[PDB]
Amino acid sequence: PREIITLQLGQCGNQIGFEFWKQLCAEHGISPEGIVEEFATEGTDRKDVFFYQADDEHYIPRAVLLDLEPRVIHSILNSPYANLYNPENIYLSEHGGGAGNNWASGFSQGEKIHEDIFDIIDREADGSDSLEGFVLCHSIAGGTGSGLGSYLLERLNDRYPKKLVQTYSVFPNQDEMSHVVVQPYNSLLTLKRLTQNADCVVVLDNTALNRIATDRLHIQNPSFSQINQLVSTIMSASTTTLRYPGYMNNDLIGLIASLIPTPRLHFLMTGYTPLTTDQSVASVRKTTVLDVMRRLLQPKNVMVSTGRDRQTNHCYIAILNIIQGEVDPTQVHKSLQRIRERKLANFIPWGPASIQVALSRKSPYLPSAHRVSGLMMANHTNISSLFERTCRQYDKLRKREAFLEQFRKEDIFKDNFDELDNSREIVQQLIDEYHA
Amino acid sequence: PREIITLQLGQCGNQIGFEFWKQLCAEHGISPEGIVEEFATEGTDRKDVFFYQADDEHYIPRAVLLDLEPRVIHSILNSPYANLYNPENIYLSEHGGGAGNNWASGFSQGEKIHEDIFDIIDREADGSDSLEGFVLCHSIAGGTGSGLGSYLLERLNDRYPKKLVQTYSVFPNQDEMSHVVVQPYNSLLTLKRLTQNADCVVVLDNTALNRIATDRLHIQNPSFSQINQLVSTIMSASTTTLRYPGYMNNDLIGLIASLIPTPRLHFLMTGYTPLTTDQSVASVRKTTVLDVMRRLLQPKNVMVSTGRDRQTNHCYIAILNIIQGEVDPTQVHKSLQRIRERKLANFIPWGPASIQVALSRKSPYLPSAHRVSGLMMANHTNISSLFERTCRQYDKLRKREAFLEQFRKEDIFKDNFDELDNSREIVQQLIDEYHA
Amino acid sequence: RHFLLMEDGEFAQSLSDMLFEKLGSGQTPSELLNPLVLNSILNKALQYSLHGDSSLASNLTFALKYLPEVFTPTAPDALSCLELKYKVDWPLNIVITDTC
Amino acid sequence: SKLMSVCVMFTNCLQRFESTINNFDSNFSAHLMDLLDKLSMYSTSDCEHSMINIIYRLDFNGFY
Incomplete structure (x- = not known):
């Protein structure tokens, strides 16, 4: 019907989407591992618009999370909200990435894992026969979210041309330029893709x-x-x-x-x-x-x-x-x-x-x-x-x-x-x- | 409608305006942090003429308080009536000033903080599309209220020409001339601005x-x-x-x-x-x-x-x-x-x-x-x-x-x-x- | 007392703003939209002063009369040709008559 | 029916993949004149109570 696939990507994009799904269970009256309250259907009249539709009244999130850094995902599985996430939709245990800090790293890693990056994220596309679109929940700060996120704004524009694209992207910090110095380069390269290769x-x-x-x-x-x-x-x-x-x-x-x-x-x-x-x-x-x-x-x-x-x-x-x-x-x-x-x-x-x-x-x-x-x-x-x-x-x-x-x-x-x-x-x- | 912006300024002008706003809550039937009495609307038929108009039934004062001496404002925040005041309309915490005791100090400090003194006090001007005027709640005693107060009587005369100007100014004491001796100089310099650069x-x-x-x-x-x-x-x-x-x-x-x-x-x-x-x-x-x-x-x-x-x-x-x-x-x-x-x-x-x-x-x-x-x-x-x-x-x-x-x-x-x-x-x- | 005797002067101060919308007569339109936008702005003037509910606001009505102010054609005034009309309702008719 | 015809006129020139833009502009000014005639028909209703005040607030909301 109106199913949206969120594209959580990067060091900052994965953490802002982690509590986004954690916010949704407290307002739907549901638990990430069970259904203990009856407030989910009498109080809320629609739940299958961001979650995957239920097989056992377990509303799976329609989410994918890729990042070069394994530190953001190792702070997830010890939290009790990670059992709602599936270990087969995105990655199994011990997923890794690059070294790695470059805009050209993820821009060059998109076409070497080109077979696998367009295989498991397309399995959620044909679940509903009327797909709403794609939201790229990615980051501009760093080279992790900005390097690989510019690649999917191009190849999903023609493979899925009749779908809405619109992102909740976070801007980086411009206070001092000591820890990072590559901030004017990776930001403007993604900002070009956000206007002509992206609608909103x-x-x-x-x-x-x-x-x-x-x-x-x-x-x-x-x-x-x-x-x-x-x-x-x-x-x-x-x-x-x-x-x-x-x-x-x-x-x-x-x-x-x-x-x-x-x-x-x-x-x-x-x-x-x-x-x-x-x-x-x-x-x-x-x-x-x-x-x-x-x-x-x-x-x-x-x-x-x-x-x-x-x-x-x-x-x-x-x-x-x-x-x-x-x-x-x-x-x-x-x-x-x-x-x-x-x-x-x-x-x-x-x-x-x-x-x-x-x-x-x-x-x-x-x-x-x-x-x-x-x-x-x-x-x-x-x-x-x-x-x-x-x-x-x-x-x-x-x-x-x-x-x-x-x-x-x-x-x-x-x-x-x-x-x-x-x-x-x-x-x-x-x-x-x-x-x- | 009939909104007046009070210009509390100086060592004595800030204290006489501090209990002026404290007098207004006892007669409006309101508390500086809440609304506990219903006497504010049935008894009083008009409240948004000196206060800012309400967003949560919190009548913000339309007040600005600048002084070179930080002693007058450090005796404010420990009082329970300072939470009604806002820490973003005038200054945040730890505001300071000059050294300082001179009429030529504040007269020369007006054009070096000229960008900031005409930035945040003009945000309250366009809140109402029919502004009443400006009252300069300043002092004549000392060099703090008399030095900087003579500058705003000139630059607000042409930037806001169709507004009423009228001040409740306090005269200094002429008993002995030991602690202060600069009293005939800073008083007559402001008294010239009170007649031709000010109406009443x-x-x-x-x-x-x-x-x-x-x-x-x-x-x-x-x-x-x-x-x-x-x-x-x-x-x-x-x-x-x-x-x-x-x-x-x-x-x-x-x-x-x-x-x-x-x-x-x-x-x-x-x-x-x-x-x-x-x-x-x-x-x-x-x-x-x-x-x-x-x-x-x-x-x-x-x-x-x-x-x-x-x-x-x-x-x-x-x-x-x-x-x-x-x-x-x-x-x-x-x-x-x-x-x-x-x-x-x-x-x-x-x-x-x-x-x-x-x-x-x-x-x-x-x-x-x-x-x-x-x-x-x-x-x-x-x-x-x-x-x-x-x-x-x-x-x-x-x-x-x-x-x-x-x-x-x-x-x-x-x-x-x-x-x-x-x-x-x-x-x-x-x-x-x-x-x- | 609040809207004919004017002892809550916020309505008559807002009448001065309605007196600040005429400025001499006659130079005002003579269309039938001339009562349509002018009966409104007096109802909008009561919310401009933030007083009273709509329960007594049905008792106030405004009838724009017609008198010549260029004195051969009509262009009616709001300094002396704008009139408030109080209403007669179902229980209260021994209080209000046509002479009053 | 005039408003539905311009969006039918719109959705076919977006269906294709010169002369259509001046057909749109001539049909744009045609329904603009009719809504202004509709705007006078609201204000000539009965010279009466709040049913002219509700439809006036329609008309100013469409103006800004």
Whole structure:
């Protein structure tokens, strides 16, 4: 019916998808090894849209996880949520990889394991006779998720041409350049494949993570154990129309169709306010829906590093405001009434704009059926500031003679560096041209 | 709608605005971290006029607090009223400043933090599409509130030209000149900016504070902990037509428009009688409104050091008499009946005068719905006695060779001392000329 | 008292904004959409001040009368030709008559 | 029926694998004029209560 195959790949893409499947059992009322609660069918009306359909009421995840590093998968099998995963769909015990840290490693390893990489991931494709598409849950940081992920964006474009492609890709961190220095090279090589060899992306910045991780979360030493908490909730938040029973844009080709203006303009800004557990003691007094979307357009919950004074000459075109759970829908048109009076979104002068609001009932659970949740999927034309940030860090590195002799020994014979530079400037010029 | 941004600035301006926001929660029936009482909407009909409008029924204050001294803000976060303040609107934890004690320090620090001082205070400006104006809750005493406050009176005059400017500024103390000696220099430099670069002020004398602080309050050692009690009540008293539901002059551009005769004549005399808690046991017998405004024009509650024998050749032009709470309005025209018989206000012989009286219901609280309150906003032409006091202490100091070599090393190359002297005498001559 | 006597002055302050939408008469349209968008913006003005429910908001109606302000054609005013109409309902008819 | 015909006109030129784009633009302006005539038909309804207020909020939502 609407079966999606997630493509978890890389050192960071496997960990953000590990707790994504772990989030799904707590809201479906199911255990990874059994069914102890009856809340799975009376409370939740649809479960076989991301999981594989049941053979013994055991909803297998439709997931594949490949990585060159064996460290990310050795921290999985000792956890009690790995018995839900199957040791025959992806790998058996003692799976390995390369050495290995290179963008050209996984780019060259795709055609030497070409027979095996297109054998076991295609067995899940013909399980349903109407496949939805493929989401590449991969990474941009490092050479593991960026090297091999650029290969599958090409060969799955023609072997599966009638399928939706759209990824939840995480952006790397640009604070210092000591541990990694190959960061401007492997990022722009995958970013070219994300626009012409891929339809849509969902951007997730790393410098904007610790802006939120010290905002309300109150940590002193930033660890990697907090990167999975902001990411796994908004992943399950994006499929609330798709997993839980909704009516309009209840498919993944429903939501993405109403937000993309044009190809190579698909970078969607994400926002999510409620992350604090001591808000729970004051939501008993009928906290309404009239105050939760006034702060979405206000740049506080954003996960995109952008300029603060560059929003006057940029214009919103498509903005999504997803409320979940208890909505009190007699005032949801009242919340959309107050949008035109502020004009917090700059509107495009050539065409109409749209503020789309939708709702779906959440899990039968006490932290879910009590507190209001707001998921934002914006589309603003100030996203070229990240593309100006990455390009200015790209041409400055090529004048310092950095990784021009250390990178072209394997499988690179011609200069494909300006092939990425002009196509990035094509995106940056057509964005500002789009508001005439 | 009618949103005002308060500009709390300086060592004394931050403390008088700290209990100003602390006064507002006790009368709105709200807590700084929660909403435990239902008296906020049934009793008070308007709350989003000084606070930011709610997102979770949490009325954020529309306040900014900058100071060179970190001592005033380190006595804030341990108090339980600081969680209502936000650590992202102004500063995060560990904010600092200069060394620092100079008028030329903050006057030169305004253009080196020029990018950051016009970035986060403008985010609250576009929250409402109809901004009321700006009130500079700053100080004249010291070099901290007087040095940086003179800069924002210039650059906000043209960047926001259609907004009301009016300040509740406190005057410094002129008892001895041992601890501070730079008091005649930094005061007159800001006083020039208060007349031509600012529309209106609200004067608050320091030598008149301890006249009242030993009148009925009965203290032996005058401390700084009493300076916030007379100031925070009359601040909330001035917005009773604006916060609580009134009809006429219910805006800040309503009250100030009916009292200013002309530009550079805007210094308003303030009066406030009821400050004693043992009056409460005899207000149960219907204490009327006929006796509360007979003592307002009588010079007893005034906060302005002026001459007692100089009121015969000076004339009142505009006098405001604000009653609050229980008024018994069938005798409020009876109180205004007795005004013409005494002629306690000398009237201008060239034009008409006006005794404006207004009322608004107070907070649903027992010390507020029982005792009569009278707020005075006078305008008398004997205010040049303070300007004669400051100018005679200004030219006497320049003949003693005091701070002419110690003040012109940084960012002062020409003598701008007589630029302040003639413009002060322009105010003093046009006041006496105004009654022809 | 709140919407005819104006002692909750937020509605009459919002009437000043409706007085800030006329600015002299007549220069206003004479279409039939002229009552259609002008009866609305007074209902929208009550939510602009955040007061009252819709239970008493059915008792307020606005009837845009027609009087010439260029004085040969019509272009009706909102300084003196915009009128609030209070309603007569099912139980309350001994309070409100046609003279009042 | 005019709105359904343009999407029938759309889905055949996407079915193929010149002149079709000006046929789309002429049919685009044709239904734009009819929805503006439909926009006047909502506002000329009865000059009455909230059924004209609901359909007005349809019309401003289609405008921005």
